[PDB]
Amino acid sequence: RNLFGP
Amino acid sequence: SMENFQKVEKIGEGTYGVVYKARNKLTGEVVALKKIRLDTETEGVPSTAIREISLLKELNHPNIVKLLDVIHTENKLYLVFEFLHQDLKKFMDASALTGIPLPLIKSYLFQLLQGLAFCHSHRVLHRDLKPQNLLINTEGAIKLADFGLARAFGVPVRTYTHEVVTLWYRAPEILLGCKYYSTAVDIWSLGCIFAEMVTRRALFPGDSEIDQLFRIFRTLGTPDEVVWPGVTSMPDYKPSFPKWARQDFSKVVPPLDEDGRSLLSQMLHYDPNKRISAKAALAHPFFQDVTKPVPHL
Amino acid sequence: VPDYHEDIHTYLREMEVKCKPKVGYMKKQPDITNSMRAILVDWLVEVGEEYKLQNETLHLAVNYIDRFLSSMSVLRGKLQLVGTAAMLLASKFEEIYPPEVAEFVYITDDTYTKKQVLRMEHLVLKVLTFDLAAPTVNQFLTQYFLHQQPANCKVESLAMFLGELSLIDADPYLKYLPSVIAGAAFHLALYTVTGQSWPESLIRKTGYTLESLKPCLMDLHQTYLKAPQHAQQSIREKYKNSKYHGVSLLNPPETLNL
């Protein structure tokens, strides 16, 4: 899972 | 950086590198530089080196080899250690005719035990004590070295790595696959080394796990619920194990005196919970007359 | 092994003060907040579950992150890279089988490259000056557990649970040392499960009393009560498992009677 990025 | 160091010669060789003796052009200090090749696309800084450095920065003690500096470049990693002339092994090889004078043995063990009690007191298990990992200098000091197999332990311990300690110096509880092991495994190793400095030969030179166990049993007795409660329930205990009778300790290391024998039997006790701690071993009467003799060479 | 238990506890009490992050670093962080920090740590809990890592590994990583962020400003888009590297260092330090680098790149859904993770590992090592053997809440609880009579699994697991929750919320928990968050958690767990309290033997050992633990305890009790409504839920989900005797399904006490 990508967090604070787009 | 490395600009201040002038290499003098190769000393040894570790698992991810080679050691050099080198001198500090500015201070004049002599040191051992242990290079570590990193590259990239790899797995990064090897976990051994992670442990070696972090734990060694917390162990400042006259009988632990001092980490002086870490030079940590884009490309390489240099560990700078204080320099020590020799290791205990390449020294017994040089002490054949003249074995090792008892006094020197006593001084060494006593220094070793001090170093080890410090480690245990700072929650570190060494887990690879054996004569090539014990360094000696010209002034009669001996010191624990090579903390690349070490680990920070917890209270109480969890289950840690099983594949640990060079076979000949490996403790029964590890051989028998116990869920938990702790500081006692280092004491087992020292006790093996104690006996080694005396007889000048490995105490339990096994070639496999079961051979190692069987050698231990033929020397100390096959352990039972009496001598070691729980043994028969341990993962790699087999009811088929031969039952050998325990020998008199005077026969295990004939040159040893009553006090020596006493201390050794406490280091090689089966039940880890009862094996002597390094701290308690410092006060043993075996050391009553102890001193720090310089190696007779 | 009570031969070294007191030496060890004394040493860790020394080191927790040296390894402690700066309490007010979030304020000096221009582009990140406690909430984002909260998202990251909640993600690290998930990672730790995906890969069955030790709880100790989670605690250490958080320690590393908080110390790294005490001196290095980071863009929001790089917070997860700092986190990833810290978890890799923690795994290498603490795990018998750490997950391979490729696995850490993959869990960020290829937000970052392997080379980035590896370069961020070096910088993290540099900023922490290789001082990785930090004390955790975990390390203190585990000692405090030896003081139950008799041992109670539920107490043990609820204490860990509570301790984990304190990782998520830098405000206020950054104010408290690991040994103190452990004390509050242990007491809270024990009270909740058995109605017993912080034992006298632990007073003797730690020098802490329920009085000195009150402030952290008060926060921790509020955190425990508000836990079902917190935006981050991975720790409650985790501790619903059988491994942890489902202690997140236990009801928190409405009052502590202090």
Side-chain angles (χ1 to χ4, degrees), chain C residues 52-222:
Chain C
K52 297 191 164 76
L53 307 168
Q54 296 291 322
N55 285 1
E56 176 66 3
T57 297
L58 206 211
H59 280 76
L60 289 159
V62 174
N63 175 268
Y64 304 168
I65 287 156
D66 284 329
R67 285 157 65 208
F68 188 89
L69 292 177
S70 288
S71 74
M72 309 282 289
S73 302
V74 164
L75 299 185
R76 63 189 53 176
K78 296 294 193 300
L79 194 65
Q80 190 186 186
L81 177 65
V82 180
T84 303
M87 204 65 156
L88 164 76
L89 286 168
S91 302
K92 284 176 177 180
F93 183 80
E94 190 68 24
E95 296 288 326
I96 295 170
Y97 301 118
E100 61 204 56
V101 171
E103 295 181 80
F104 285 101
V105 178
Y106 177 68
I107 55 155
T108 70
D109 203 51
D110 296 60
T111 314
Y112 303 110
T113 54
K114 179 175 179 159
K115 184 71 168 195
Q116 279 175 307
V117 175
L118 278 49
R119 284 196 217 184
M120 183 53 95
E121 182 180 77
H122 229 70
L123 179 61
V124 174
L125 284 172
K126 284 167 186 298
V127 165
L128 302 183
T129 50
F130 274 92
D131 299 325
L132 297 198
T136 59
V137 176
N138 181 66
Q139 284 170 57
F140 276 102
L141 271 175
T142 257
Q143 296 169 281
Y144 294 174
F145 293 169
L146 302 174
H147 285 253
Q148 314 162 96
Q149 268 181 62
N152 182 313
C153 289
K154 291 169 52 193
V155 170
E156 289 183 27
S157 299
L158 178 66
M160 287 181 94
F161 167 65
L162 290 172
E164 261 181 78
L165 286 181
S166 83
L167 293 172
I168 294 292
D169 302 303
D171 187 343
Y173 287 103
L174 238 42
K175 299 193 323 181
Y176 305 114
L177 291 168
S179 56
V180 171
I181 295 166
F186 187 44
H187 165 83
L188 196 40
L190 186 78
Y191 191 59
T192 284
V193 174
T194 80
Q196 296 178 92
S197 290
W198 185 249
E200 123 76 25
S201 67
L202 284 177
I203 301 179
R204 282 194 290 95
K205 190 194 178 55
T206 67
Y208 298 156
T209 50
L210 229 33
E211 170 86 271
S212 54
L213 298 172
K214 191 181 157 198
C216 186
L217 188 46
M218 294 288 90
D219 290 318
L220 198 50
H221 180 225
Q222 283 305 118

